[PDB]
């Protein structure tokens, strides 16, 4: 039986450039760098983002943009703020997606490697009470 | 600030196929279903897997296999168990702790990992 989420590993062309993206927007706490030593299979870093263990590895593989996405939890009062923080870094933001009166607000946007991210307000419960 | 993970949404070509997959391996628990083709709305489902909200939507599969992945935690004693359970689904399975990498029918790379972060580092 699965205990829970282990981690999520993303692949990026420019490690350092992606790192700042994570620390600025998600207040990501870097906890490990392959540079923290000599002889590492690959250039990579591990971060803690609200509990979640996120891993970033450098590589040439590029994924085509799709609706597959990871979504983090935020509050409704912080929607504007995050939209300001994202905008202030010039990262691309998708337009408001069609809701269903009872579906909280969301912010969609990419990193530099076609990774669709989302900051979701509103909960799962409010999405089931239907 | 970010309270934590809200959910992960995956796109798949066959909703029913992926479901059986999630149930047979992750013991995924369906908790919601909608999406009416007749009313022009792609189908979707919501499962809970080890407390995590997972949304599956129907659409195109990943055109290419990359190394981006989602990993779930298990005990290192169930490694052999899950290895075989996975071989039983016939899915493409690429041969701190042990892990198991394998794809679904939409080119998503998954992994079951034994051992924790506390370990991995410290
Ligand atoms: C065994 C682990 O899954 C590693 O390959 P990581 O994805 O943390 O780089
Ligand atoms: C409001 C949610 O982000 C939905 O649109 P989902 O991505 O779970 O389909
Ligand atoms: Mn991994
Ligand atoms: Mn979503």
């Amino acid at each position: 039986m699965i205990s829970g989420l282990s981690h999520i590993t993303l692949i990026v062309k420019d490690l350092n450039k992606t790192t700042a993206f994570l620390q600025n927007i998600f207040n990501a706490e870097e906890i490990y760098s392959s540079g923290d030593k000599t002889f590492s299979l690959s250039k990579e870093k591990f971060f803690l983002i609200a509990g979640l263990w996120i891993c970033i590895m450098e590589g040439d593989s590029l994924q085509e943009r799709t609706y597959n996405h990871i979504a983090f939890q935020i509050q409704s009062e912080e929607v504007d703020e995050y939209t300001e923080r994202i905008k202030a870094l010039g990262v691309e933001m998708k337009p408001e997606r069609p809701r269903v009166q009872g579906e909280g607000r969301s912010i969609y946007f990419y990193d530099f490697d076609n990774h669709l991210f989302e900051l979701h307000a509103g909960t799962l419960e409010q999405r089931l009470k239907r």
Side-chain angles (χ1 to χ4, degrees), chain A residues 1-37 40 42-128:
Chain A
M1 171 189 252
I2 318 302
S3 311
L5 191 66
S6 181
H7 60 271
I8 300 182
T9 296
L10 301 182
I11 307 303
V12 291
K13 78 185 80 145
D14 186 345
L15 185 66
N16 297 327
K17 187 169 155 59
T18 292
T19 295
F21 168 79
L22 293 173
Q23 309 177 321
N24 281 348
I25 303 179
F26 310 89
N27 290 55
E29 180 191 334
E30 177 168 335
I31 62 177
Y32 171 80
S33 190
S34 57
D36 297 349
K37 58 177 191 58
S40 185
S42 54
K43 201 201 251 176
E44 58 171 55
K45 296 177 171 177
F46 300 169
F47 312 74
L48 284 180
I49 296 189
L52 179 46
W53 171 14
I54 312 297
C55 293
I56 305 296
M57 284 186 71
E58 200 166 58
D60 173 71
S61 62
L62 170 62
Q63 46 179 54
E64 349 86 52
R65 292 189 168 190
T66 68
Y67 191 49
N68 289 278
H69 60 273
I70 309 184
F72 294 84
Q73 183 72 62
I74 62 167
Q75 303 320 305
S76 307
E77 317 84 56
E78 321 178 70
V79 174
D80 289 351
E81 302 202 312
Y82 274 103
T83 302
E84 192 68 55
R85 300 172 57 166
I86 295 302
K87 189 188 299 180
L89 295 176
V91 315
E92 183 188 354
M93 282 187 266
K94 304 306 272 287
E96 277 276 358
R97 197 177 181 68
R99 281 170 285 173
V100 295
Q101 298 171 302
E103 188 174 356
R105 301 252 294 308
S106 295
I107 298 171
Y108 278 102
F109 60 89
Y110 304 84
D111 61 346
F112 307 112
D113 298 274
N114 295 325
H115 295 78
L116 187 56
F117 282 88
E118 161 184 32
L119 292 179
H120 185 59
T123 56
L124 170 54
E125 189 181 302
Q126 186 69 63
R127 185 62 162 287
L128 294 179

